[PDB]
């Protein structure tokens, strides 16, 4: 029993992930059957009870077209559900890759980070923040399943469900007329969460290096309060960590956004600029 | 020549406002012709080139149903355009009312502010900020055109095109799974623009009292830079202003968001709690 979604199909058995409002299946083109796809099914009624808008991810994925961001191939609307047909990542997620490898070398981390940074450059230039980056939505794709080493992995960022747009300066003036009544922080495009992804990336790199996240907690409750109470945190960096990677990690893992490394500093951090 | 929009109609001659992506016409129910409506026409192609999502205003207007917020009656989608059929405000905007009256008494300001505050309470409870409040989208409605004095005016907030949702604490955990990789400012719901509307309201009240906005500028450019350069501003309050209204104005018109009065303080400000 295959479900049909435009020119594609999937089995409901082939679940490859899910969240509150969506499930994702491995599927394929119905005729070009070696063209695998990831089909995301969103329940409309469940979604309208959140603040999440239905067309946000669609629009973002079209605007973010790039080799380190999952592609969107088709949208199919039904009475109850919307289907997004997107790029399938045949390597699964970074979480599983880490479980299998334990910890990554600094050389491997550098290669992955170069790709994550490329993704982040395209988000940055469109004023998009992801806000929920984690090993579960940083995905691995192998172009040939023969080339199965690090140099055959292409990283692709997924799940923009919790993402948001940041306006620029005239992005406020150009559509909202005279700004005379507009709050200064809106006119000036001041955004508390503009560096959210940089923290995330920090936690992920740290976990690649060390084998655990830098600040664990038994629940969402504990982690909120731990971050509430401790207004300044030092992650534990192993002594063996190269000086520049440690510098990068401590810059990313700044509890206070204003003290956190910004994108240009991240993109041009000396750890990232290397040869082999 | 009347255009038809579901059970309603309008003339293209009866333009009552516009912006970058929309025009609004006075119209009416086709059979109950004394039921006036405001019909907003949005060009789809123009809109998709902005960051603005098409269904945002629709969803917000449904969630904000309230007597000081324009109602949404119908949505009609066409190949090129979406039409929103909304509550018509037969009194026009506050801008025109101010042009005609010059300046308002403190008693009148108190009555208008009570209604604006009621609107703000419903936004606040749904975590919505408007971000572009101004005299042009704070509208006047008269239920009987006979009762034409202040006590016959009902204030209604309009144009949520530039509005945004703020998540709550578990609004992050409840949909985005484990928050272990999530930025602290995202987990904690820290928002630079959470008080944007309070500044706006400040500028509007000030203009009602004084007859001009507190910080004029020849362009959007000047106003941005003036706010960039001057990190602390004192609005000029007339000596005749009642002490508590002056206090309220200076609390709202804080250039720096962190020093600005918050919603609960605004809603319970002693100027607002009065009898006649
Ligand atoms: O997209 C989400 N999470 C990311 C993981 C699931 N989605 C994807 N998974 C994948 N592939 C995948 C993810 C996890 C596991 C696997 C299955 N493994 C493949 C290799 O090893 C065998 C099993 C494959 N590719 C693409 C995608 C996204 C839609 C474009 C959210 C879950 C609701 C949306
Ligand atoms: O909604 C917008 N701006 C607010 C003013 C235009 N819209 C409205 N105007 C009004 N009425 C209105 C506004 C300005 C002028 C007038 C015309 N006057 C009526 C009384 O005196 C005679 C002329 C009437 N009512 C409702 C609405 C909004 C859609 C629900 C934006 C313009 C693109 C969206
Ligand atoms: Cl957004
Ligand atoms: Cl939003």
UniProtKB/Swiss-Prot annotation, chains A, B:
Instruction: Describe the processing and modification events after translation.
Output: Autophosphorylated. In response to nutrient limitation, probably phosphorylated and activated by AMPK, leading to activate autophagy.
Where does the UniProt annotation locate this protein? Cytoplasmic vesicle membrane
Q: Which residues form the Protein kinase domain?
A: 10-272
Which residues are named in the active-site annotation?
A: 132 (proton acceptor)
**Which positions does UniProt annotate for ATP binding?**
16-24, 40
Protein family (similarity comment): Belongs to the protein kinase superfamily. Ser/Thr protein kinase family. APG1/unc-51/ULK1 subfamily.
What UniProt notes about the protein's domains is: The CTD-like region mediates membrane-binding and incorporation into large protein complexes.
> What role does this protein play?
Serine/threonine-protein kinase involved in autophagy in response to starvation. Acts upstream of phosphatidylinositol 3-kinase PIK3C3 to regulate the formation of autophagophores, the precursors of autophagosomes. Part of regulatory feedback loops in autophagy: acts both as a downstream effector and a negative regulator of mammalian target of rapamycin complex 1 (mTORC1) via interaction with RPTOR. Activated via phosphorylation by AMPK, also acts as a negative regulator of AMPK through phosphorylation of the AMPK subunits PRKAA1, PRKAB2 and PRKAG1.
Subunit structure, per the record?
Interacts with SYNGAP1. Component of a complex consisting of ATG13/KIAA0652, ULK1 and RB1CC1/FIP200. Interacts (via C-terminus) with ATG13/KIAA0652. Associates with the mammalian target of rapamycin complex 1 (mTORC1) through an interaction with RPTOR.
Protein's recorded name: Serine/threonine-protein kinase ULK2
Gene for this chain: ULK2
Task: Please give the range of the full-length protein represented by this chain.
Answer: 1 to 275 of 1036
């Amino acid at each position: 029993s295959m479900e049909v979604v435009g020119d594609f199909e999937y089995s409901k058995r082939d679940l490859v992930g899910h969240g509150a409002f969506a499930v994702v299946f491995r599927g394929r083109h119905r005729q070009k059957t070696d063209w695998e796809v990831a089909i995301k099914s969103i329940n409309k009624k469940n979604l309208s009870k959140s603040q999440i808008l239905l067309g946000k991810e669609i629009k973002i994925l079209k605007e973010l077209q790039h080799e380190n961001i999952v592609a969107l191939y088709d949208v199919q609307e039904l009475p109850n559900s919307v289907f997004l047909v997107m790029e399938y990542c045949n390597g699964g997620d970074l979480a599983d890759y880490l479980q299998a490898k334990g910890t990554l070398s600094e050389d491997t981390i550098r290669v992955f980070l170069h790709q994550i940074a490329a993704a982040m450059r395209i988000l940055h230039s469109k004023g998009i923040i992801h806000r929920d980056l984690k090993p579960q939505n940083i995905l691995l794709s192998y172009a040939n399943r023969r080339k199965s080493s690090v140099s055959g992995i292409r990283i692709k960022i997924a799940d923009f469900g919790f993402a948001r747009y940041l306006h620029s300066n005239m992005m406020a003036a150009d559509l909202c007329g005279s700004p005379m009544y507009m709050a200064p922080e809106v006119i000036m495009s001041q955004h508390y969460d503009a560096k959210a992804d940089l923290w995330s990336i920090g936690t992920v790199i740290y976990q690649c290096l060390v084998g655990k996240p830098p600040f664990q907690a038994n629940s969402p409750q504990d982690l909120r309060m731990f971050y509430e109470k401790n207004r300044s945190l030092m992650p534990s960096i192993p002594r063996e960590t190269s000086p520049y990677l440690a510098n990068l990690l401590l810059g990313l893992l700044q509890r206070n956004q204003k003290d956190r490394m910004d994108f240009e500093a991240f993109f041009s951090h000396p750890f990232l600029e290397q040869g082999p």
